[PDB]
Amino acid sequence: ALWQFNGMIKCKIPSSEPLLDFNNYGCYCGLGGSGTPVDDLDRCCQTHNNCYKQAKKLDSCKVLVDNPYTNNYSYSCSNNEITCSSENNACEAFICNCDRNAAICFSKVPYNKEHKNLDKKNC
Ligand SMILES: [Ca+2]
Ligand SMILES: [Cl-]
């Protein structure tokens, strides 16, 4: 769920408020997405978007009427390291991995304020 993703990002980037810093950024960081990523961070979000799309197509995910952003899974942050729980069922585990990968990706790429609240004309 979004609440967990927010926590994961903070786990990797302690100084951030993810739902603010990484929302409405570039062409893919936020709800939906289209076009060519404007930078590596935007690309992290495109990959995350693609991961969610793959998830929704999994047999295990079609069983729950909850979208990836509302589907709660279990994970832990410790020493700024993210660990997806073995107690997660197939769908939740896949989503957890998608979020973990994105959180780590976000923490390894540059952040360009110029792309915050990007004109969707550029997408
Ligand atoms: Ca376009
Ligand atoms: Cl990690």
Swiss-Prot record:
Record carries keyword tRNA processing: no
One biological process term in Gene Ontology: antimicrobial humoral immune response mediated by antimicrobial peptide
PTM description: Activated by trypsin cleavage in the duodenum. Can also be activated by thrombin or autocatalytically.
Disulfide bond annotation, renumbered to this chain: 11-77, 27-123, 29-45, 44-105, 51-98, 61-91, 84-96
Binding, Ca(2+): 28, 30, 32, 49
Enzyme Commission number: 3.1.1.4
UniProt main location, coarse: secreted
One annotated GO molecular function: signaling receptor binding
Active site: 48, 99
One annotated Gene Ontology cellular component of this protein: cell surface
Catalysed reactions listed for this entry: a 1,2-diacyl-sn-glycero-3-phosphocholine + H2O = a 1-acyl-sn-glycero-3-phosphocholine + a fatty acid + H(+); 1,2-ditetradecanoyl-sn-glycero-3-phosphocholine + H2O = 1-tetradecanoyl-sn-glycero-3-phosphocholine + tetradecanoate + H(+); 1,2-dihexadecanoyl-sn-glycero-3-phosphocholine + H2O = 1-hexadecanoyl-sn-glycero-3-phosphocholine + hexadecanoate + H(+); 1-hexadecanoyl-2-(9Z-octadecenoyl)-sn-glycero-3-phosphocholine + H2O = 1-hexadecanoyl-sn-glycero-3-phosphocholine + (9Z)-octadecenoate + H(+)
Secreted is among the record's keywords: yes
Cofactor binding summary note: Binds 1 Ca(2+) ion per subunit.
Record keywords: Autocatalytic cleavage, Calcium, Disulfide bond, Hydrolase, Lipid metabolism, Metal-binding, Phospholipid metabolism, Pyrrolidone carboxylic acid, Secreted, Signal, Zymogen
Compartments reported by the entry: Secreted
Cofactor needs: Ca(2+)
Family: Belongs to the phospholipase A2 family.
Subunit organization: Monomer or homodimer.
Function: Secretory calcium-dependent phospholipase A2 that primarily targets dietary phospholipids in the intestinal tract. Hydrolyzes the ester bond of the fatty acyl group attached at sn-2 position of phospholipids (phospholipase A2 activity) with preference for phosphatidylethanolamines and phosphatidylglycerols over phosphatidylcholines. May play a role in the biosynthesis of N-acyl ethanolamines that regulate energy metabolism and inflammation in the intestinal tract.
Protein name: Phospholipase A2
Species, as recorded: Bos taurus (Bovine)
Residues represented out of the complete protein: 23 to 145 of 145
